[PDB]
PDB file of C-alpha atoms and ligand atoms in Angstrom:
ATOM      1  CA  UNK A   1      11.494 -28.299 -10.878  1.00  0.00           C
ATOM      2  CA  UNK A   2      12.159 -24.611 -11.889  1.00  0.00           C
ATOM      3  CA  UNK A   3      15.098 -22.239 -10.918  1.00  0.00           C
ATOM      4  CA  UNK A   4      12.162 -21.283  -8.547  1.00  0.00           C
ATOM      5  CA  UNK A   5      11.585 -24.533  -6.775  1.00  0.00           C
ATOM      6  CA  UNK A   6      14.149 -27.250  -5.871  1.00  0.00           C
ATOM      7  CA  UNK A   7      13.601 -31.028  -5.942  1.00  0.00           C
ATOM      8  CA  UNK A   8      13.309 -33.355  -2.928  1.00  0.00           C
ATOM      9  CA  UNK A   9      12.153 -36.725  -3.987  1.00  0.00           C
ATOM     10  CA  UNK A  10      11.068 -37.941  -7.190  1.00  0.00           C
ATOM     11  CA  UNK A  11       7.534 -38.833  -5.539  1.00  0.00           C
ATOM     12  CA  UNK A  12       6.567 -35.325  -4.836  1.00  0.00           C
ATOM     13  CA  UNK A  13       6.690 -31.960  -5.555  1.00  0.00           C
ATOM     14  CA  UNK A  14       9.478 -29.460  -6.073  1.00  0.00           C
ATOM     15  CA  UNK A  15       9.382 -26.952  -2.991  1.00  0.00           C
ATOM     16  CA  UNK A  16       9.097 -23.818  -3.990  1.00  0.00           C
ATOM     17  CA  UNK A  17      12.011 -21.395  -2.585  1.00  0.00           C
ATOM     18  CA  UNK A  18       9.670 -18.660  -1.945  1.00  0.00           C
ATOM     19  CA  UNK A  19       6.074 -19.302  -0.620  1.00  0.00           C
ATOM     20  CA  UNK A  20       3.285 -16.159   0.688  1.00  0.00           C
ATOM     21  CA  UNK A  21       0.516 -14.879   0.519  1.00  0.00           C
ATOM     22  CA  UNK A  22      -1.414 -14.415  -1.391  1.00  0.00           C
ATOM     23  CA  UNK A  23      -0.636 -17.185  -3.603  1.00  0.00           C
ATOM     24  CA  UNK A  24      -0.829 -19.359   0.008  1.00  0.00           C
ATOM     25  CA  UNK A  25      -2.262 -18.396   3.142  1.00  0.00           C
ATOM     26  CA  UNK A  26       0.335 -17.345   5.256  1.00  0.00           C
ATOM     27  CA  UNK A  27       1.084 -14.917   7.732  1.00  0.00           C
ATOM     28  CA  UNK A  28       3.964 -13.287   5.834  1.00  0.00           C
ATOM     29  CA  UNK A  29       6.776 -14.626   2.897  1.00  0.00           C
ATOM     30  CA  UNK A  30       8.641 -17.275   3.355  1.00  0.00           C
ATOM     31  CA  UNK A  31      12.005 -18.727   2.364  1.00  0.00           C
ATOM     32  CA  UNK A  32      13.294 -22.074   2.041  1.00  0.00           C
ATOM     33  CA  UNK A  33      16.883 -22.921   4.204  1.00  0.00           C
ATOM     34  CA  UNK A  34      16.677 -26.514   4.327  1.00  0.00           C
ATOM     35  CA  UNK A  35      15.308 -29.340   2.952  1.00  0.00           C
ATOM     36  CA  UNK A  36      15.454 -33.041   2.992  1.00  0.00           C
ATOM     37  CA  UNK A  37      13.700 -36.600   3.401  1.00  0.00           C
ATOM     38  CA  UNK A  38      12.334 -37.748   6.681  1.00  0.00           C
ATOM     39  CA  UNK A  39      12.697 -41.480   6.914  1.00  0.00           C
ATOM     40  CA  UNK A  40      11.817 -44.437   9.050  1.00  0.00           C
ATOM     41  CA  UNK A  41      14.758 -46.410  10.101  1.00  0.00           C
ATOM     42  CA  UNK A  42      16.616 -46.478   6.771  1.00  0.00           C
ATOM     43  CA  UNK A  43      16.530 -44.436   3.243  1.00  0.00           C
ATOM     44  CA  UNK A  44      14.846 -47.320   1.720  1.00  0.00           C
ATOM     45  CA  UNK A  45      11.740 -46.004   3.701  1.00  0.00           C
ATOM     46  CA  UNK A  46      10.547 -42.572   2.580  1.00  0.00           C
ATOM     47  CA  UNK A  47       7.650 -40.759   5.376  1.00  0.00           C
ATOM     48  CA  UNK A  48       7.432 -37.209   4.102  1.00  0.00           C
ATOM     49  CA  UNK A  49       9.699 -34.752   2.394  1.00  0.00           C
ATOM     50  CA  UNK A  50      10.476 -31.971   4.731  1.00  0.00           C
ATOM     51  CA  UNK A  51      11.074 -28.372   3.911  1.00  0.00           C
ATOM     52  CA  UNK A  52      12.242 -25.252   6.706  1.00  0.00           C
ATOM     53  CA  UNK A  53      11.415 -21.710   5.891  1.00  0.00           C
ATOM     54  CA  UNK A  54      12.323 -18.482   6.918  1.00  0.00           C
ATOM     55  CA  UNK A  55      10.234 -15.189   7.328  1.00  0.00           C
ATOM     56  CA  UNK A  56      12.396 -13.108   4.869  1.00  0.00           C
ATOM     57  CA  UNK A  57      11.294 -10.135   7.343  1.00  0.00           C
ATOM     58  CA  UNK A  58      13.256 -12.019   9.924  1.00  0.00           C
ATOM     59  CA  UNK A  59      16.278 -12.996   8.386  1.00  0.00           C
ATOM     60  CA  UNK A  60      18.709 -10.088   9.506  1.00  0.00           C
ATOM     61  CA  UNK A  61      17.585 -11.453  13.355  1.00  0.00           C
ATOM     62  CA  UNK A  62      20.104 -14.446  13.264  1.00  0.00           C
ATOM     63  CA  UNK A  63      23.526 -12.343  13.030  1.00  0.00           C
ATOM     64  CA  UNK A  64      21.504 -10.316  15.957  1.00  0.00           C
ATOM     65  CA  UNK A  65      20.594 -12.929  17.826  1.00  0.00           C
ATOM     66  CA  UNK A  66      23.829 -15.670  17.368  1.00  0.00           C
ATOM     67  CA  UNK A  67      26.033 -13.005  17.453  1.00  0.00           C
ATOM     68  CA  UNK A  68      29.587 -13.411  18.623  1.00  0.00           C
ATOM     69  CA  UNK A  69      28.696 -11.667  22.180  1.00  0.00           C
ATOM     70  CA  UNK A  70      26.066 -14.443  23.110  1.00  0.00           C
ATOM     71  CA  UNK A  71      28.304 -17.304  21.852  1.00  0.00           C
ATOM     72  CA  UNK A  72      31.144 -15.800  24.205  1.00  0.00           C
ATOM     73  CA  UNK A  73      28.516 -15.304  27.188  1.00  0.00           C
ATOM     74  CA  UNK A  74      26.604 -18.780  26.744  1.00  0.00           C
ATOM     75  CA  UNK A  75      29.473 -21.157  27.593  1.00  0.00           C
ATOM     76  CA  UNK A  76      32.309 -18.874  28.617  1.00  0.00           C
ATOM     77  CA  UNK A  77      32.427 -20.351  31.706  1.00  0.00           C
ATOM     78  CA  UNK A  78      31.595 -24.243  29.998  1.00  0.00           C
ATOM     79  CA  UNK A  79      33.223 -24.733  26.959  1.00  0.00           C
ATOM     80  CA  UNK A  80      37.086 -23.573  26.076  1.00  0.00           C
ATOM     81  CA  UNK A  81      36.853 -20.348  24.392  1.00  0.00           C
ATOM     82  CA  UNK A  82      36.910 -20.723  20.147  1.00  0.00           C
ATOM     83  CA  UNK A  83      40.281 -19.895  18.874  1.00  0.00           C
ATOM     84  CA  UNK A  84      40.810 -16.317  18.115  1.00  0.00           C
ATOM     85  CA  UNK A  85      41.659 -16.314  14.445  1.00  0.00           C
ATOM     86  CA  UNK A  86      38.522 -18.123  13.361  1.00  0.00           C
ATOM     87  CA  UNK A  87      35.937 -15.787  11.869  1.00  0.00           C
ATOM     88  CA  UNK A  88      32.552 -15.699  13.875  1.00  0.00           C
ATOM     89  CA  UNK A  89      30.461 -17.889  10.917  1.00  0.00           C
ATOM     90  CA  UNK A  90      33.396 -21.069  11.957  1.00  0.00           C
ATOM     91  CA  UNK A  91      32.837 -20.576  15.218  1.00  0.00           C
ATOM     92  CA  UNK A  92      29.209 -20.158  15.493  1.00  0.00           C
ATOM     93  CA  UNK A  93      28.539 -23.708  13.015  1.00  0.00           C
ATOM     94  CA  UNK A  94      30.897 -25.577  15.322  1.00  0.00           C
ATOM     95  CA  UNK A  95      28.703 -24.662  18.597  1.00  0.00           C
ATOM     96  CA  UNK A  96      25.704 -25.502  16.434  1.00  0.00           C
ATOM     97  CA  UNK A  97      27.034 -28.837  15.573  1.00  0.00           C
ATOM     98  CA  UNK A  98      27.984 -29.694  19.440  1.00  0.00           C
ATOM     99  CA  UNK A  99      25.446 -31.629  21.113  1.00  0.00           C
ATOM    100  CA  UNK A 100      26.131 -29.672  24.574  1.00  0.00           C
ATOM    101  CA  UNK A 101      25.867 -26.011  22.974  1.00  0.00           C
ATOM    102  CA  UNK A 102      23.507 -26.760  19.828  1.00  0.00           C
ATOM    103  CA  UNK A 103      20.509 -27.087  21.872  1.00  0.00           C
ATOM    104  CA  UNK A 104      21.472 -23.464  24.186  1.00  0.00           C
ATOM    105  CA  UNK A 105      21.962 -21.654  20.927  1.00  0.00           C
ATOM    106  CA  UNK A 106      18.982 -23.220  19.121  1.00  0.00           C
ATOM    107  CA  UNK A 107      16.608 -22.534  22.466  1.00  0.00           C
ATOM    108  CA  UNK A 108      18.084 -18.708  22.088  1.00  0.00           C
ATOM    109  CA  UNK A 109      16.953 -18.407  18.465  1.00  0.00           C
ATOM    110  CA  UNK A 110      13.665 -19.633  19.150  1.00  0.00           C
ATOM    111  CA  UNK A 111      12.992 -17.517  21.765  1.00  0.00           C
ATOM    112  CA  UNK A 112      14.044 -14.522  19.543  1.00  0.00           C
ATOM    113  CA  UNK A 113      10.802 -13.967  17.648  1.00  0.00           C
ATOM    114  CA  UNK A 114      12.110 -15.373  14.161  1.00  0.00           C
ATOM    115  CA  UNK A 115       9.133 -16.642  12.454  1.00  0.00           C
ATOM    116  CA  UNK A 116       9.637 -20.286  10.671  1.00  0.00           C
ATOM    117  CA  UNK A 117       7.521 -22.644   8.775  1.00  0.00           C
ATOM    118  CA  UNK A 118       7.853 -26.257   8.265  1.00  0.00           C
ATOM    119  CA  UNK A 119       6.373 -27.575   5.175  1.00  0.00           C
ATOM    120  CA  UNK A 120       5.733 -31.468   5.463  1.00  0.00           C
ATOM    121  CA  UNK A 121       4.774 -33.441   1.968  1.00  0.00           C
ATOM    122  CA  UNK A 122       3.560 -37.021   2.941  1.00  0.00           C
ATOM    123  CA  UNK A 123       5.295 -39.535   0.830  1.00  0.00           C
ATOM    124  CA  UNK A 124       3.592 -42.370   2.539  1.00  0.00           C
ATOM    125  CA  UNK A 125       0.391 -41.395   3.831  1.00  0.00           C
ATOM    126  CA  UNK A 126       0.183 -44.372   6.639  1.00  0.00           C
ATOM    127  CA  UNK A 127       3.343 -43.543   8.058  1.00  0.00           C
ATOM    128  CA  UNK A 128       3.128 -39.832   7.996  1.00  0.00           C
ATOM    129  CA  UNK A 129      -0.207 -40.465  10.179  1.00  0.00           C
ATOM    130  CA  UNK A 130       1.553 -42.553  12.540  1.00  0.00           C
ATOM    131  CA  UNK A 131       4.489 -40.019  12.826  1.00  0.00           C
ATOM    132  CA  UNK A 132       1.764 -37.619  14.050  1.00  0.00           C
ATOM    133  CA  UNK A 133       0.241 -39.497  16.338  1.00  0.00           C
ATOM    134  CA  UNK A 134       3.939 -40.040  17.991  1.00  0.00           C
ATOM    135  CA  UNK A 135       5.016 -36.355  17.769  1.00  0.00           C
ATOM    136  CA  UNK A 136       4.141 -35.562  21.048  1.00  0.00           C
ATOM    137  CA  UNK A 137       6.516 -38.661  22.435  1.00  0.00           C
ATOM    138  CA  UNK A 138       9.031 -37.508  20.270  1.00  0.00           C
ATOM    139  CA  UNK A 139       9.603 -33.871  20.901  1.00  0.00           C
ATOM    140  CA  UNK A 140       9.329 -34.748  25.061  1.00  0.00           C
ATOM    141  CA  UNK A 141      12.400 -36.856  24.515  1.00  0.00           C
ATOM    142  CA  UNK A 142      14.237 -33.498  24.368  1.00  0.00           C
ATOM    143  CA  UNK A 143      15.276 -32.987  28.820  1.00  0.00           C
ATOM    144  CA  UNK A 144      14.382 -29.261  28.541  1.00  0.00           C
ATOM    145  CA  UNK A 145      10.618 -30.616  28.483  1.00  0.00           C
ATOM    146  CA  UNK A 146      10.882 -31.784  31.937  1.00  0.00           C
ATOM    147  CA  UNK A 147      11.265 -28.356  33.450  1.00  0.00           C
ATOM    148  CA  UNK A 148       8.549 -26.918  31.965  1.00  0.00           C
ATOM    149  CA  UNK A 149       4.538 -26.624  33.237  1.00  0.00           C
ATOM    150  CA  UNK A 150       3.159 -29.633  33.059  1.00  0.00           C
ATOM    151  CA  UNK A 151      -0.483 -28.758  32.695  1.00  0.00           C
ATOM    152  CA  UNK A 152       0.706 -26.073  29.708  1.00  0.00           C
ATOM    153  CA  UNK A 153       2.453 -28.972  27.884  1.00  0.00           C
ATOM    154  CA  UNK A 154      -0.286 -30.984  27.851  1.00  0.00           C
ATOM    155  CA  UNK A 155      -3.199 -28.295  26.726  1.00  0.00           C
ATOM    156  CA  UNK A 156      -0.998 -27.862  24.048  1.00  0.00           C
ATOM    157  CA  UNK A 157      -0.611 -30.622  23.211  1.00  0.00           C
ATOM    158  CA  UNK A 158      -4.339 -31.108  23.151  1.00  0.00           C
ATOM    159  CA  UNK A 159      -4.573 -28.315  20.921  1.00  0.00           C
ATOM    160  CA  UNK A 160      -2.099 -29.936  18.434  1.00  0.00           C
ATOM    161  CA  UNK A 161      -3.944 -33.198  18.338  1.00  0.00           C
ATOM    162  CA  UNK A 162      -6.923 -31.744  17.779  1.00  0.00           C
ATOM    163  CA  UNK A 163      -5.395 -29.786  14.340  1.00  0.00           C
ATOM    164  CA  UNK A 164      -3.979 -33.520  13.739  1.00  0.00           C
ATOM    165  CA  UNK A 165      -7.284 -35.236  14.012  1.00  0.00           C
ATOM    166  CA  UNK A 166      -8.394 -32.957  11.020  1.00  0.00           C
ATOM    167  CA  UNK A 167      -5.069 -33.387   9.372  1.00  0.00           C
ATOM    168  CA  UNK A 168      -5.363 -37.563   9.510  1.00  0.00           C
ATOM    169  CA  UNK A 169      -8.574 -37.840   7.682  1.00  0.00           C
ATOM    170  CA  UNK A 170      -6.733 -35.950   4.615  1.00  0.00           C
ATOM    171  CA  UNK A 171      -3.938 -37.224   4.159  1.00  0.00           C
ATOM    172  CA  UNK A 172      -2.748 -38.218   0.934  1.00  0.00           C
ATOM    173  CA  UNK A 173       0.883 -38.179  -0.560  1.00  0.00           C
ATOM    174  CA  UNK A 174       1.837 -35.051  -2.525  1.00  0.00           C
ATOM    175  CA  UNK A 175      -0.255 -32.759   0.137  1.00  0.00           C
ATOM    176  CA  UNK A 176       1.281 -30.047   2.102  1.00  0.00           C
ATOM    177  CA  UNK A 177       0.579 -30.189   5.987  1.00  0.00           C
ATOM    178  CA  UNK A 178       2.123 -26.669   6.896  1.00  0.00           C
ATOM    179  CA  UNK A 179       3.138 -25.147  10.638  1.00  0.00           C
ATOM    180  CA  UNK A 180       3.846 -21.813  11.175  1.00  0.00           C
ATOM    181  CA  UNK A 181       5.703 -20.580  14.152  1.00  0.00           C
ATOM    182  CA  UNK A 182       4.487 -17.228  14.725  1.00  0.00           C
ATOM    183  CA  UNK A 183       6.813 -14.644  16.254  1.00  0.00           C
ATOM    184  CA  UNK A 184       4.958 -15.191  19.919  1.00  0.00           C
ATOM    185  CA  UNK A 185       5.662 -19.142  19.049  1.00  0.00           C
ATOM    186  CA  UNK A 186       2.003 -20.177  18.737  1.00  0.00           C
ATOM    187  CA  UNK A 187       1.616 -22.160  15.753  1.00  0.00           C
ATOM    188  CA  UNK A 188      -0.957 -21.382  12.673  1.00  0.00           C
ATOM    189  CA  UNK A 189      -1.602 -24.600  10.918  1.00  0.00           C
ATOM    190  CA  UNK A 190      -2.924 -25.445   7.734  1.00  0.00           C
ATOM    191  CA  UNK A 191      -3.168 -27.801   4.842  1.00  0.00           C
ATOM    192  CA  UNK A 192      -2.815 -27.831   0.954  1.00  0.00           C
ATOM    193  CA  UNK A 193      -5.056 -30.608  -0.282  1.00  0.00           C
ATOM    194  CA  UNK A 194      -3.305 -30.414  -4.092  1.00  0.00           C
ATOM    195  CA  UNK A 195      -5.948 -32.520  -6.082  1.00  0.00           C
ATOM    196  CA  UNK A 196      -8.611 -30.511  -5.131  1.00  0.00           C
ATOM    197  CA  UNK A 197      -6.272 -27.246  -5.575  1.00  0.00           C
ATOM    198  CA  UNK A 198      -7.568 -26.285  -1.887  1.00  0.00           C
ATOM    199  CA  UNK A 199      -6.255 -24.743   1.469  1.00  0.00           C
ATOM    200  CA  UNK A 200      -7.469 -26.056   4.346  1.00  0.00           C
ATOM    201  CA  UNK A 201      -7.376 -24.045   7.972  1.00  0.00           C
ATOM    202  CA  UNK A 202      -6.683 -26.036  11.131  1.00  0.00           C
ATOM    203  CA  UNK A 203      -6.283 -23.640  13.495  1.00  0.00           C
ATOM    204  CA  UNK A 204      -3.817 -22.258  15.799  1.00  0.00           C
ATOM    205  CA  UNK A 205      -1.964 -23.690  18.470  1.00  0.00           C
ATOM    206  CA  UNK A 206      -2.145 -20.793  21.550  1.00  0.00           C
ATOM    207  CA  UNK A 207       0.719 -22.492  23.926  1.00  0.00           C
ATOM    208  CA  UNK A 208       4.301 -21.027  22.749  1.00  0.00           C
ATOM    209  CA  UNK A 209       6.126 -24.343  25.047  1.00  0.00           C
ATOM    210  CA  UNK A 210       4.389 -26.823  21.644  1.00  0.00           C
ATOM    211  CA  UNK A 211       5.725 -24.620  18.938  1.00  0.00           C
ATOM    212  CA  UNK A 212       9.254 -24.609  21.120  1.00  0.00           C
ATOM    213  CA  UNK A 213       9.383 -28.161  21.483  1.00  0.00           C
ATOM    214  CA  UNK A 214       8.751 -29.322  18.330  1.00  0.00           C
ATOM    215  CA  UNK A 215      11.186 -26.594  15.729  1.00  0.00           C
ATOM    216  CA  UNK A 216      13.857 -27.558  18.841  1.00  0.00           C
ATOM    217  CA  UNK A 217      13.275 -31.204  17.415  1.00  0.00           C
ATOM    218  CA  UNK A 218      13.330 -30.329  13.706  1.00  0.00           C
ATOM    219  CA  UNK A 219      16.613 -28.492  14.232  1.00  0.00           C
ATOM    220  CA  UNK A 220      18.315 -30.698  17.142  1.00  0.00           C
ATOM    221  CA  UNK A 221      21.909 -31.722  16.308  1.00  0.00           C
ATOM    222  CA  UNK A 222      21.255 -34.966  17.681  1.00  0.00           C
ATOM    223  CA  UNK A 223      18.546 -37.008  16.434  1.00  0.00           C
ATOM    224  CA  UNK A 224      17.047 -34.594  14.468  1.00  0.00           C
ATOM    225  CA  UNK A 225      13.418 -36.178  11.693  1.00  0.00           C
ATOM    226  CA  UNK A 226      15.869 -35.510   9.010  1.00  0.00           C
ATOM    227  CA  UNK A 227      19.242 -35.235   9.284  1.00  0.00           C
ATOM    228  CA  UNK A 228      19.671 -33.714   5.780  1.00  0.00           C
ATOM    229  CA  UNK A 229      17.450 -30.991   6.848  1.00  0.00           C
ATOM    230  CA  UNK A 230      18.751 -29.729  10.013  1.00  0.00           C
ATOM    231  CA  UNK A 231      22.709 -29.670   8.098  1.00  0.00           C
ATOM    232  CA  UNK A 232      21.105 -27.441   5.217  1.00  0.00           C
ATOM    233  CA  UNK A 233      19.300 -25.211   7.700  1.00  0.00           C
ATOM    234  CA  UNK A 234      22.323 -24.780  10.034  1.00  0.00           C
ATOM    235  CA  UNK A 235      24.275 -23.647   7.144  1.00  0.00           C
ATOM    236  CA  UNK A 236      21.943 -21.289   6.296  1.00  0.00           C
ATOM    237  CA  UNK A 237      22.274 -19.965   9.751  1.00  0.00           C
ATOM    238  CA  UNK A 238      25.676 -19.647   9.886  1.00  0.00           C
ATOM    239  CA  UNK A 239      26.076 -17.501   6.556  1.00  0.00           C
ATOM    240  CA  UNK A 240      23.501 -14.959   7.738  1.00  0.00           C
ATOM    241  CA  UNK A 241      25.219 -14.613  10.860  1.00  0.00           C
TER     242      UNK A 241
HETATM  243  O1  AKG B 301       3.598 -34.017  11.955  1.00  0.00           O
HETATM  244  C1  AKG B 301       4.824 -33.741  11.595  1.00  0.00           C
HETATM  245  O2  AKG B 301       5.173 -33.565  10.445  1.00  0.00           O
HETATM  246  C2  AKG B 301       5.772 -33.691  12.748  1.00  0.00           C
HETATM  247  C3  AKG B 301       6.321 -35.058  13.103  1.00  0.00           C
HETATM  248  C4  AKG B 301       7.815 -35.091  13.132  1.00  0.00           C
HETATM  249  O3  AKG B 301       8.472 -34.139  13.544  1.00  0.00           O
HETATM  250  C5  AKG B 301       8.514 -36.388  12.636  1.00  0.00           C
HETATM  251  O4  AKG B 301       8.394 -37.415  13.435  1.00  0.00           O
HETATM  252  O5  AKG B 301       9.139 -36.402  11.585  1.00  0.00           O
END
């Protein structure tokens, strides 16, 4: 790793802190808030090394969008108010770290148009595939999913397993499988096949509820892929705020 890329497991890659176009083919430049190792029941059992970006466009829309006034107004009649004396950044990481406000405030941001990307390196290509094929189960687990159009969830969901049928018959550890959440949160997937040195475009995911669903999931407080990733992104949050 260089001063420009920082280290997530020994098996893969350093992820670069900055990534664009036109060195790769994004919608705009990204930066890296959180990292970490997705894993399968225990730490012995490495699935992919996951990485969270930022639009750097985008960033001044978290102190807009998490401001004080919306903390106040989101659970002013729920919660007991924060203590006075505590500056804005303490109280907004404590309601990010509560399971009952985390999920308000992270449905907020995501509504906001802040364009993310998730950048997922397959240590161990079987599992990765199977973690695919159960993302759909595992980002409906989240109750707000019930509420929601039934017949849009599951075209979108069509449209995602179609971008992961191409995905599956590539994958190979040390590969990038990227997701983009655009700022109308439809999703522009694509994939870095690295021995080859070649991009590959899946597509684009048209139904924002999919893109919603599944960064709610990367950055739930509870139950999150990767733990480790979801803390280093929430602090990133809070010191922009
Ligand atoms: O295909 C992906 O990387 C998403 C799956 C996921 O969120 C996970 O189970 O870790």
């Amino acid at each position: 790793a260089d001063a420009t890329s920082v280290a997530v497991d020994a098996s893969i890659s350093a992820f670069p802190k900055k990534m664009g176009p036109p060195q790769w083919p994004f919608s705009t430049q990204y930066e890296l808030i959180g990292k970490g190792v997705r894993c399968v029941s225990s730490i012995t059992f490495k699935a992919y090394g996951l990485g969270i970006y930022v639009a750097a466009e985008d960033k001044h829309l978290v102190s807009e969008v998490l401001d004080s006034k919306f903390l106040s107004q989101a659970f002013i009649d729920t919660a007991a108010p924060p203590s006075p004396e505590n500056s804005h950044q303490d109280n907004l990481r404590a309601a990010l770290n509560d399971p009952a406000k985390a999920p308000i405030l992270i449905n907020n941001l995501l509504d906001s148009g802040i364009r993310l990307m998730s950048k997922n390196t397959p240590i161990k290509a079987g599992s990765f595939k199977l973690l695919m094929d159960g993302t759909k189960k595992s980002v409906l687990k989240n109750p707000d999913s019930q509420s929601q159009d039934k017949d849009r969830l599951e075209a979108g969901f069509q449209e995602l397993h179609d971008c992961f049928r191409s995905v599956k018959g590539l994958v190979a550890r040390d590969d990038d499988f990227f997701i983009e959440l655009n700022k109308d949160c439809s999703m522009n997937l694509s994939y870095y096949a690295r021995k080859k040195d070649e991009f590959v475009i899946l597509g684009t995911v048209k139904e924002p509820l999919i893109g919603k669903l599944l960064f709610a999931h990367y950055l739930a407080a509870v139950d999150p892929p990767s733990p480790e990733a979801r803390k280093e992104v929430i602090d990133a949050l809070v010191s922009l705020s």
